[PDB]
């Protein structure tokens, strides 16, 4: 069983903040005024662009994509770009990826905001799974991720106008407006 603690030991209080210090470190209690380890872990010093990754759906890896001017890829580029293009057929690779790439195309075109524009696309990936009367049409639940995506600020909507844009503003929009109300009340 994982128990992790910094209790002073000498005068257990159970328990109090011990300081993070500024230079010395080690979190000496303002009570027994002793030590605990040496710290030595700077969290401020995260991996910058100069390795860090902020994944929202599963876990990102990447493959190939060679372009370093050392030795020309030519023959080998097509050797590996074909070989990685064969692998994205093994276990239902398409679906989430297709959804998120088509998602960034429909929003960028209407210039939807990234901070909350991307937020609704996470909601779609939660809505594409779970099986609650979706009567899924792809376009339908996309108008939910077009509404919550515009919820950042009224960037493009005026959500009704973006509804009046393109296709399917009626009964199929109704199925979707309901799905969002059910997802919001879902703890």
């Amino acid at each position: 069983n994982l128990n992790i603690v910094l209790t002073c030991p000498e005068c257990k209080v159970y328990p109090p903040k011990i300081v993070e210090r500024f230079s010395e470190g080690d979190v000496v209690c303002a009570l027994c005024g002793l030590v605990l380890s040496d710290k030595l872990v700077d969290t401020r010093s995260e991996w910058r662009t100069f390795e860090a990754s902020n994944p929202l759906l599963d876990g990102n890896n990447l493959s190939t994509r060679i372009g370093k001017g050392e030795t020309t890829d030519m023959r080998f580029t097509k050797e590996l770009n074909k070989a990685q293009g064969k692998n994205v057929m093994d276990k239902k690779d398409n679906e989430v990826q297709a959804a998120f790439a088509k998602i960034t195309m429909l929003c960028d075109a209407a210039e939807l905001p990234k901070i909350v524009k991307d937020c609704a696309k996470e909601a779609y990936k939660l809505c594409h799974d779970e099986k609650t009367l979706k009567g899924k049409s792809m376009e339908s639940i996309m108008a939910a991720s077009i509404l919550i995506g515009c919820r950042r600020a009224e960037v493009a909507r005026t959500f009704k106008e973006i509804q009046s844009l393109i296709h399917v503003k009626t009964k199929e929009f109704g199925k979707t407006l309901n799905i969002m109300k059910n997802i919001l009340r879902g703890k």
Binding site: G25, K39, V41, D42, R44, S45
Partner: protein, 49 residues
């Protein structure tokens, strides 16, 4: 008392360059170490070695 050698005296334009001592007096005595190496950190803004 007078000075036995007369001196070269007069105005001359001087610039005040940046990099002032107070902006450079780093001194550490054991502190925050890196995660990967457990070796002291770099830069004086992080209180490094």
């Amino acid at each position: 008392k007078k000075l036995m050698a007369q001196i070269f005296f007069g105005p001359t334009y001087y610039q005040r360059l940046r990099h002032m001592v107070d902006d450079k007096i780093h001194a550490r005595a054991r502190g925050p170490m890196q995660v990967l190496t457990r070796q002291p950190v770099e830069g004086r803004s992080r209180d490094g070695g």
